[PDB]
Amino acid sequence: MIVKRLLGWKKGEQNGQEEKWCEKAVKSLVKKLKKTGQLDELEKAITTQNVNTKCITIPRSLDGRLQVSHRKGLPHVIYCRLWRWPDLHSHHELRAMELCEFAFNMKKDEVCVNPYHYQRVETPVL
Amino acid sequence: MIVKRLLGWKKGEQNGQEEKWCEKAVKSLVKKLKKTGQLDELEKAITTQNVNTKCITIPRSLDGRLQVSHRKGLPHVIYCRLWRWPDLHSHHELRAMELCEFAFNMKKDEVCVNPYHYQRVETPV
DNA sequence: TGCAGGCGCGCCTGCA
């Protein structure tokens, strides 16, 4: 199973309840990418950490949030936290790479959730 | 024994040598907190993971490091790694909570080693 | 520069 394989790349140490949620977050993404034929690209990006992979997109919601098992969050934040930065606190800490065509900030009909298309930046000035 | 009970809360999977070191690190802290009457507060913070605990302090050294059984480290890093984040890289990955009065960064005469007074952050950009 | 690690005096413990 691709879900168990992708979960093997998950960052951080989660408790029982948190583990179950992360699994639902991976299952949710896997179901979407399977329908659009982008599943192999996610496997490639996650297992190899290759920045030069294609955008991995999902439809953007009206308010930008994604709900997974009764919890809402920004999808690029969810998947960047899951596979790269477990202590990432917000989207203000993320900036998309130059080659990202569907970066969250662009506010297109599709949002790129490829964690290797984002970089961490300094928290904005007050 | 408070040492055995606090060790039961240790994070990660340690080999024989590391287990013995972790025990010395808990024994070292327990001896200091007993002398300043803070042992019950450590027990409360560790066993209940309660952020709403008092600061748990030890005297700060000239260079900030603490030596336990021939190994030196920043004491808030040592105790946060032990009870919260076993892969904690450095003090650059820890920020103290707003209510921490003796946070390591404050460089006061006393340093807070309450792991629930710190939050783990990604390495500064 | 920060930071890691070698080394010893001073403090401590456990025997006399």
Add this chain to the structure above:
DNA sequence: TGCAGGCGCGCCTGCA
């Protein structure tokens, strides 16, 4: 209370 021996904080050297 003399004395032996363990260990850490402070001082130091050297590396990234």
